[PDB]
Amino acid sequence: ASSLAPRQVIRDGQFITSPNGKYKLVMQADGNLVLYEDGTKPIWNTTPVGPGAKAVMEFNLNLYNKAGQVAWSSNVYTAYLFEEFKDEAYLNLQDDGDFGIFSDEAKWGSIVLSRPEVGVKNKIIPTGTVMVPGTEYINGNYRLAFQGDGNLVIYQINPQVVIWATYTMGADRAVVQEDGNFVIYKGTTALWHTHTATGMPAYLKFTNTGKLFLSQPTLLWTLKRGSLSKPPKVIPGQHGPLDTTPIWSWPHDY
Ligand SMILES: C[C@H]1O[C@H](O)[C@@H](O)[C@@H](O)[C@@H]1O
Ligand SMILES: C[C@H]1O[C@H](O)[C@@H](O)[C@@H](O)[C@@H]1O
Ligand SMILES: C[C@H]1O[C@H](O)[C@@H](O)[C@@H](O)[C@@H]1O
Numbered sequence: 001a002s003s004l005a006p007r008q009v010i011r012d013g014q015f016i017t018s019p020n021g022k023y024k025l026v027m028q029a030d031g032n033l034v035l036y037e038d039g040t041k042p043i044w045n046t047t048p049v050g051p052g053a054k055a056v057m058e059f060n061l062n063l064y065n066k067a068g069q070v071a072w073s074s075n076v077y078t079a080y081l082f083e084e085f086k087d088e089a090y091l092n093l094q095d096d097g098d099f100g101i102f103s104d105e106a107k108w109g110s111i112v113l114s115r116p117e118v119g120v121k122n123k124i125i126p127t128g129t130v131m132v133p134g135t136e137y138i139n140g141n142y143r144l145a146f147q148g149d150g151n152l153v154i155y156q157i158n159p160q161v162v163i164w165a166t167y168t169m170g171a172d173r174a175v176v177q178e179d180g181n182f183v184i185y186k187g188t189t190a191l192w193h194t195h196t197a198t199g200m201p202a203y204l205k206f207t208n209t210g211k212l213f214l215s216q217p218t219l220l221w222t223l224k225r226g227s228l229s230k231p232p233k234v235i236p237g238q239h240g241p242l243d244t245t246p247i248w249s250w251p252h253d254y
Pocket of ligand 1: 149
């Protein structure tokens, strides 16, 4: 895996790896968070905090000691750190060895939430996905289907219940676009879309509570570039056999 999911913990020699296999970020049993090149050359570290330590992705990437204190932190510059950000923010380790933190706000949703869903889990539908009639996605007791008849439907699986639909009869494709929009089409005719064309790539989240949201990557911080006041344009990365988060890369300079 090349990423860390919200709240993920790693410790005692657990690690992630850049898509190309060259860089590895390992939270060591001696409590040193270390970036390795080719498996053998360490090229960055926190330095060790000692045994019983751990690293957790919780808005910041935070290094804790046995005693439960934070010993090192990404120290991402934030207005507020709302507890819900810790449930949302994720990290990617990329092919030139940089790693960065994303915290993305929903741009669109099948429904408007009065407040965050506790312990919700998102099935990520990545930028560039083209759904074709017959495509479906399953998360818990819900199913997102792009149907033979062109409708995009969210069903509760057992018992079977329609929760939401677009009624885009005759659509032959739905595209999660690089420009930021999610668009259902017959041919080149857009029958329905989210109105989120920003030029920052889209991805979708399909929840285990029967909801769909579109977000776009908002890169806040990298190891090499520190905190970023404006999020740069990033590009879909190589989805891994299973990663749980979106995967991106970002340019080295301008
Ligand atoms: C699987 C679904 O596929 C069709 O497209 C639609 O009309 C439904 O009647 C059917 O249940
Ligand atoms: C929401 C419903 O809308 C249409 O009736 C058709 O696409 C069905 O299969 C679908 O379940
Ligand atoms: C509805 C249209 O909105 C934007 O122009 C762009 O996202 C197009 O691809 C889209 O189809």
